[model samples]
Target: ARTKQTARKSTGGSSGSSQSLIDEDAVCSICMDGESQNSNVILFCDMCNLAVHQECYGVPYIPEGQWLCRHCLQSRARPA
Candidate 1:
C-alpha cells in the first residue's frame, strides 16, 4: 500500500476507496496542508462529507470506526 493515500480524484474504479457524492473536494478544514495532508491524519464526515483534520476533531481520543464530526453529530442526518 502506498503509505500516504491523502486524496486524489479518480474517474472510475473497481475498489473505490475515496469517493465523491457531490463531486466533493477533500481538504482538511483545519490544516489544509499542501491542501492535501500527509500522514493519513485527515477525515471526512460520514454524515455531511465535510473534510476535517484528525486532530482537528474535537475529541480527547482518536476515533475508531465510522467518523461523524461534531457538526454532523448535532444534526445527525444524511445530507443532500
Candidate 2:
C-alpha cells in the first residue's frame, strides 16, 4: 500500500493540456452540475471559488468580471 509518489521535479514538459493548480472538477451547489457544459454555464465565487450555474439565477444581466456568491457577496457586497 505504498502509493505516495511525491516526485516534485523532473516534469519534462508534459503539462501541455492539464492543470492541478486550477482543476476542472467544479460542481454547482445549485442544480448540481459539473463544469460549464451544455447551456448550463456555471460560475465560481471570487472568494472561495464556490460553483453555481448561470441559468439558475434570476438576474436580468449576467455579472461582468469577478463575481462572488451570495454568501460571500453579503460579507463582501458593499460591506467588505
Candidate 3:
C-alpha cells in the first residue's frame, strides 16, 4: 500500500493568543520545513519558484536581487 501526501496551509492568528501554524505544503524541497517565528531564512528560485533553505543549499548570503536555482541555470545554459 502507498500513502498519499496531503497539502497543508497556515492558519493566521495572533501569536500571544493563538500562534499561526506553518503551511507544510509550502516547505522547502531540500530541508522540508516551513516558516515559523524563529525559522531560518528560506530563498525562492527566481525562475522555477521552488523554495529552499539558504543554509541547506550552502548559500553563504542572500543575493541582492534575483537568485536562480541549479536546474534553471542549467536549462538556460544549454544551447538553443
> What are the lDDT scores of the predictions, listed in order?
0.54, 0.52, 0.56
Tens digits of per-residue lDDT for model 1 on 1-80? 00113444445443655554344346766765655433455566676666766556554555566666567676656554
What C-alpha lDDT, on a 0 to 100 scale, does residue 4 get in candidate 3? Answer: 17
Clash numbers, per candidate = 0, 0, 0
lDDT of 1 at 77: 67
**Clashes in candidate 1: how many?**
0
Per-residue lDDT tens digits for candidate 2, residues 1-80, read 00111113356535764554453445666664433344455566677666655556544556556576677778867764
- Candidate 3 lDDT, tens digit per residue, 1-80? 11113333455343554555555433566664543224455566667767766655677766676676778878887957
TM-score of each: 0.45, 0.50, 0.54
**Global CA lDDT of candidate 3, please?**
0.56
Candidate ranking (TM-score, best to worst): 3, 2, 1
Poorest stretch of ten by lDDT in candidate 3: 1-10
Q: Top model by TM-score, which number?
A: 3
In model 1, which range of ten residues has the least summed lDDT? Answer: 1-10
